[PDB]
């Protein structure tokens, strides 16, 4: 059982931390995380501290290998992985009165709050400095531009309560550590030029570059150009009572390929720095709220009767939107986003089957940037196959450049859910969005290259009259190097039926791109063959799934039995023991079952859900939400709630602990999974909206915002009633509660 | 794939011999060459500075240390701090200058160079002429273990220049050699000189292990040095033209394993026993070494006619299989290279208890029962594994030499349970030749109970709980990693669980106060009797197959035939799964059971057994061609038993799987005595009665081997015509020939 460390103010559109909590510091640091997908900062201290903390600046896509080779006797195993890396602080002031340094954990201070607004993204951070003879009130404020997203803007104020002079430094600092342990830059340059003052710096081997320039709304006394280092010193005169501020406006521009001449990386990053500094801060805010109010209008969720989980839901959506907005088709989202080191901003197969449908119903262009992340890294994924002695494309269990970067063979040898898990992210994209041209120019390449990948690696048994795959772990990972995992057959058969529906519809051109692929008649035949002959362990008697191969017969432990004393099972139990028994990590038979819920009948979901969700421990971000949809689906209300449980407050409340480390995208968008195929019962089916409203027992109402063919749809489920409405003119036909209802402005449809 | 012979020593029946120097064999040298007398072990390494590549090495058993560094885990169970054998004081190290030029191989002219090893005596000696300045220097080097006061080593030194010149000789003791070619694994303790004498007390970095090595030669020397960790002698010769100078070095070393020894009465031992020793010439120290191998050669020598290359291989063999191991300590084993090499870090592996065992069966009690009693001496380690594996009773670990799993592989030290069934058959099979009543009572059921019992905790019930078996594990075939009903695991646990349950049942045992200190309750041994019951063992009763493991038959099929030469070995051209997810096995695995228990399978249980497993076996492991030559042989297939024998005596001589330069191979030299017993000459032991089956290598006019059954001391000759049995004891042996009983009282003559 994990419990909540409640020590942040609930607020329904802001989050606050009233005191500082130095125990929290990096929880902190993580919560109050700014990021516009292309770029994102911690909610590390802009001034020197000395106490426990995590300064990370974070580029998507901007990554380094591992120093020195993990040696490896063996082919296919990663012997160099690879992470995104710190980057320039370019928040990173000092503030010097008469000596004193301003450091949170050395000197004395008073009235200390921290504020994010999820309607802005303003990040505000006040205190009151008791210095020598003085209480300085200092205001720090920062963004990063929503739209024009190489763009981050600080305000910094002083206002002391008698006469005094202080020292504030601006600096951009590229010498920061990644892994507490190494710099992953070297320098190329550091220039001032007219107002602005920058550094071009390069990563170690990813042929990589960054320039990062600053200027303010203030002259300098003076500046130093250092080794990936540059300051401008303010020696300012602060009259009582009197306020002094200065803007400080910062432009980053990225090269994650090294084909861009530095001279025109500078002229671009001090182009739009000069164009960014005509702008008030408090403008920039303005700007920054319009991009968040057009995301609240199409996606925001209303909770009544808990502010906990108003907070929580908006504060989900709010880190949905910063980790991704569709600027990069090269740019994925890490299991933190970027608010952290651990997980080295690596995409897995999460993003495809758990985190991409926030996008399919609130922005198009996000959807189909996850998907090109993956198209952008085929080439990856094909030399990914060959280690593993197969063909086709391999997309790796844990990235950001492509290749694998999961240095376990136990994973990474055996798990092909990121592949199949692509294959139904182009599935799902296409059921939502019928995108004929990016399956023309796409998805088809893409499906080919998976169905090759799956052909070579799948093999027929010793008489070859059944098709599998040997030697494999599904989603759940106690079960390593089992045969007729029926997630692994279950989803590879209908990545093979979904290309053979493809090829064969005649307004798609398929011979030049089969060429290209080198895939033939043979190939076409073998896959028609692999996909009838695929084993699928299913009984129509009991309507169970076994997940694989001699799971009914593993010794049996009922987890109810598993002490407090024991957990982790990894930190108490020897490694090998977890793998022969029947408990479970994750869901299995559950994850193919929620991915295709409208071939299921109830008793089909009743029966797996009641022999598998006994035996599953729900060590994962995915369990709990899945569970709680399905028990949804076959009327366990109770279960439902239950499994919801504190969805929107995991991170908030630092539930497993390691918010420290950054916050648990997956568990995000696991809320609005949670919220709307849940509760919300939302199912796409025949090319129809189907909704199956239940209440949540703690929230007198709840209402969320989706968009349907063009539809922007708001629904509101109460005690009585489901409400219904949008504003477009035209019919759209909805299903609920199973009956069919053609939508033009409101249905109410009483419960 | 194929592989082929690098044949560069001389054919002799009872010598190895170099015929000059061979510069890209000098690690092969040095591993075939290697003197050992199971106490220490020395690879044939050049006395003197050699600058070419060379791997020096001194070993003691059970003289180890761990890893500088933890390997970290975030899992329980997994080895974080591996062990090994260390190098220890290099006791032969000399160096020759001549009028500055120093002797070294690498670097100076020399001519007429010979090195040779005599498998009569252990004497192994090396010849060459220096071709310095305006000299000829003829060096011999002579160099002895004592085979019965294993202390003991000794050295020879002569020089013969062809003019009136003056050289100088350094004799060292030096314990700054290096393992892994990284670390020195000894501190410094004290360096010293009393009367005659010099030498060197050293202690492990960590083990609690310390070593006094001492030496005194019979020429008084013109000054010594003591360094940290080494001693010199300095030698001032003049060498008259024509005329042999020799110098004599005695060399007593000294361990303690343990840690007690005070050091005071270590440094007296040492010089006493050196003391003892300087009163014998070298020349009488060989004649006291041959009396040694004298005996073992009449107890166990092998003789083929119409092959000189098989009558030096297998006698080579047996000339190893008496240094590695002749019963000198209850606390020492034989690793998988002897005390060869530092590659597997002179680790005991399952192999000791179910191929190397035999060999010392049928030829020293008080050597096959001491490799139980180390067992017996690591039982603690091993109940410590059990726990590191969340199970209770003794878990022996699949590499260890001092009881502590030191294999940091998951996918076997997890899977694996073949080395504590292996002890359990070790105990069985020594039981089986000489019933010794009070190993058993004092010892035996002991290690029995306390196998069971991790038999027991680790094996565990079905889902519904109407079969028992090992879930996640892994047989003798490492190609299969995490499967279920391994019936090579279930077979032997079943063995092991019958075993127990017998020897419990046997009144001449008392079976109270073992049962009570193992904590063995009449609960465990109805748990054992049912999980005996229920026993999964995959057997089709018309087949007469064993499956290997659940899923095995309907693995995807890959004909061995298809794999490529380029492709070899797999590991290093397949992704490493690959191999696990086809029915290509590495090595024996039914198989193993089968031979482990020949004598319980029918001619058509085998053949069935044999036709489904041989051809999917790859034979990567130095211990499958053997026993498929066994059962081939058992079952009427002379051309596969002859394929398979092939080139069992000459593995390591002419180097098959090029790297002997690492070290000899332990099990595959146990092997070729296997083969030739069990194999050609059908042994068994059948209701206490000695079974033959002799047949023909086609390479061979005759074979003649040696055993001892119930103290009768057998030679038996296998030709074309004629099986002719011999001893000399007065007592009638019934003995089983092509399935006729004899009553044996001094000759047999059997026509074939």
């Excluded at 702008?279 to 996606?299: E, I, M, P, R, T």
């Excluded at 060959?386 to 997309?395: P, V, W, Y």
């Excluded at 209440?695 to 349907?708: E, G, L, M, V």
Aim: aromatic share 14%; proline share 2%; net charge neutral.
């Amino acid at each position: 059982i994990k419990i909540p460390k409640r020590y942040l103010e609930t607020e329904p559109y802001r989050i606050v931390e009233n005191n500082f909590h130095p125990d929290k510091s990096m929880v902190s640091e993580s919560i109050f995380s700014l990021g516009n997908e292309y770029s994102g900062t911690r909610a590390f201290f802009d001034e020197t501290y000395s106490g426990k903390q995590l300064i990370g600046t974070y580029f998507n896509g901007i990554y380094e290998y591992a120093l020195k080779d993990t040696p490896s006797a063996y082919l296919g195993i990663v012997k160099r992985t690879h992470f995104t890396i710190n980057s320039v602080n370019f928040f990173k002031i000092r503030i010097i009165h008469e000596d004193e340094e301003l450091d949170l954990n050395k000197v004395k201070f008073e009235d200390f709050k921290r504020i994010l607004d999820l309607r802005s993204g303003l990040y505000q951070r006040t205190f009151t400095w008791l210095t020598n003879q003085a209480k300085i009130k200092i205001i720090i404020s920062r963004l990063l531009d929503m739209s024009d997203c190489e763009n981050a803007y600080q305000m910094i104020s002083f206002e002391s309560d008698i006469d005094t002079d202080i020292k504030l430094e601006l600096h951009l600092d590229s010498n920061i550590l990644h892994w507490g342990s190494d710099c992953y830059w070297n320098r190329v340059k550091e220039f001032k030029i007219g107002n602005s003052i920058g550094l071009t710096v390069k990563t170690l081997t990813t042929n990589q570059t960054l320039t990062s320039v600053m200027r303010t709304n203030l002259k300098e006394d003076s500046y130093q150009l250092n080794q990936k280092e540059v300051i401008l010193n303010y020696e300012l005169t602060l009259e009582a009572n009197k306020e002094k501020t200065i803007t400080r406006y910062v432009t980053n521009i990225i090269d994650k390929n090294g084909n861009q001449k530095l001279s025109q990386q500078r002229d671009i990053a001090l182009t739009k720095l000069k164009e960014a500094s005509k702008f008030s801060f408090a403008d920039l805010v303005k700007k920054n709220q319009k991009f968040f109010n057009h995301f609240y209008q199409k996606s925001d969720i209303l909770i009544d009767g808990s502010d906990s989980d108003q907070q929580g839901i908006r504060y989900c959506l709010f880190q949905m939107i910063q980790a991704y907005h569709g600027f990069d088709p090269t740019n994925t989202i890490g299991a933190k986003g970027l608010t952290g080191e651990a997980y080295s901003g690596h995409a897995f197969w999460d993003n495809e089957t758990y985190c991409l449908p926030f996008y399919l119903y609130s922005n198009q262009e996000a959807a189909k940037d996850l998907i090109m992340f993956r198209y952008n890294t085929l080439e990856e994924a094909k030399a990914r196959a060959k280690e593993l002695d197969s063909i086709g494309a391999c997309f790796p269990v844990a990235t950001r450049n492509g290749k694998e970067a999961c240095n376990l063979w136990q994973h990474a040898s055996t798990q092909f859910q990121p592949s199949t898990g692509v294959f139904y992210a182009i599935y799902h994209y296409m059921k939502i969005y019928n995108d004929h041209k990016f399956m023309q120019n796409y998805g088809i390449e893409m499906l080919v290259e998976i169905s090759k990948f799956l052909l070579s690696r799948g093999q027929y048994n010793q008489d070859k009259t059944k098709f599998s795959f040997y030697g494999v772990m599904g989603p759940d990972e106690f079960k390593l190097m089992v045969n007729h995992n029926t997630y692994t057959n279950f989803m590879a058969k209908k990545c093979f039926q979904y290309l053979d529906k493809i090829l064969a519809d005649k307004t798609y051109k398929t011979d030049k791109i089969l060429d290209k692929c080198g895939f033939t008649k043979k190939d076409l035949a073998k896959m028609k063959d692999a996909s009838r002959k695929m084993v699928i362990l299913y009984d129509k008697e009991t309507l169970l799934f076994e997940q694989n191969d001699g799971f009914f017969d593993m010794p049996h432990v009922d987890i109810k039995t598993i002490k407090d004393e024991e957990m982790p099972i990894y930190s108490h139990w020897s490694y090998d023991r977890i793998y022969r028994t029947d408990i479970i990590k994750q869901p299995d038979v559950l994850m193919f079952m929620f991915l295709y819920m409208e071939e299921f009948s109830q008793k089909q979901l009743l029966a797996n859900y009641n022999y598998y969700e006994p035996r599953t421990l729900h060590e994962s971000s995915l369990s709990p939400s899945i569970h709680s949809i399905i028990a949804s689906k076959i009327g366990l209300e109770k279960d439902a709630n239950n499994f919801f449980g504190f969805a929107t407050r995991l991170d908030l409340d630092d539930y497993n602990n390691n918010t420290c480390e950054g916050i648990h995208m997956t568990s995000i968008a696991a809320a609005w999974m949670n919220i709307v195929y849940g509760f919300g019962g939302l199912m796409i089916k025949n090319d129809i909206l189907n909704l199956t409203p239940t209440s949540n027992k703690n929230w007198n109402y709840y209402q969320f915002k989706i968009t349907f063919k063009n539809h922007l749809l708001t629904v509101k489920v109460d005690k009585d009633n489901v409400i219904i409405t949008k504003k477009t003119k035209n019919i759209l036909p909805i299903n609920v509660y199973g009956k069919k209802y053609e939508l033009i402005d409101k249905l109410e449809i009483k419960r």
